Amino acid sequence: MNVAHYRGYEIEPGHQYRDDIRKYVPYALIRKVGVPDRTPIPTTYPEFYDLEADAERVSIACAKIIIDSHLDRHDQGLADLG
After folding, report:
1. How far apart are CA 23 and CA 9, in angstroms?
2. CB neighbours of 78 closer than 8 A, spacing ≥ 6?
3. Residue pair 15/59 in contact by the 8 Å Cβ criterion
4. Which Pfam families does the protein's record reference (predicted)?
């Protein structure tokens, strides 16, 4: 599972559950090409998915939305990457 590039940002599709919601939700890691050595910011989205495969496809769409929203809207997320 190689990372896919997006607007110059790398995406790491995957799935993981948080103990805060004890549920499975789109979990992916984004790394910037200019400075990927910076702490990664896990991507998440308000929703739940029983299937891990569904989380992988959603994580890719969420990562793009979070990266795009971060540059436009100040949702404070990839601030460490820039």
Report:
1. 27
2. 9, 30, 32, 41, 66, 67, 70
3. yes
4. CV_2116-like (PF21617)
Residue with tokens 């910037």: 32
What does the block give as tokens for 41?
């910011």
How much is the CA Rg of the chain, to the nearest whole Å?
12
Q: Which of 26, 33, 29, 43 is nearest to 7 (CA)?
A: 33
User: Could you give the count of Cα atoms lying within 13 Å of 18 in the half-sphere of its Cβ?
Assistant: 13
How far is 18 from 36, CA to CA, in rounded Å? 24
- Residue 43's identity, in one-letter code, is T
Determination technique for this entry: NMR
Q: Measure the CA–CA gap between 13 and 41, rounded to whole angstroms.
A: 13
DSSP E strand boundaries for the chain: 4-6, 9-12, 15-18, 23-26, 29-32
Q: Which domains does the chain have, with CATH numbers?
A: 1-82 (3.30.160.350)
